[PDB]
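Forwarding the complex inputs:
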Amino acid sequence: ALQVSKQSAQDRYDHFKELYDENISSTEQKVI
Amino acid sequence: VSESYRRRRQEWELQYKQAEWEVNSVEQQINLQNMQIKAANKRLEQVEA
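Prediction (whole assembly, two chains):
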């Protein structure tokens, strides 16, 4: 059952890495 | 202003994913105690016998 702990923590690692890291482009920068 | 929508969206979306894995997790208690109770019930065999 505790394989759900790796499910959650892995998804968190993925989410936050994709979130913060290498953010880029006009999708945000459009107004500047 | 168009990004504020996405920003507000994503925290709720990720919290819902949180709830998903949390409910996946809690099954442990269900099976743990099911086993516990069935074994303890059988343990009365030693006493009554």
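The helical segments of chain B are 2-48.
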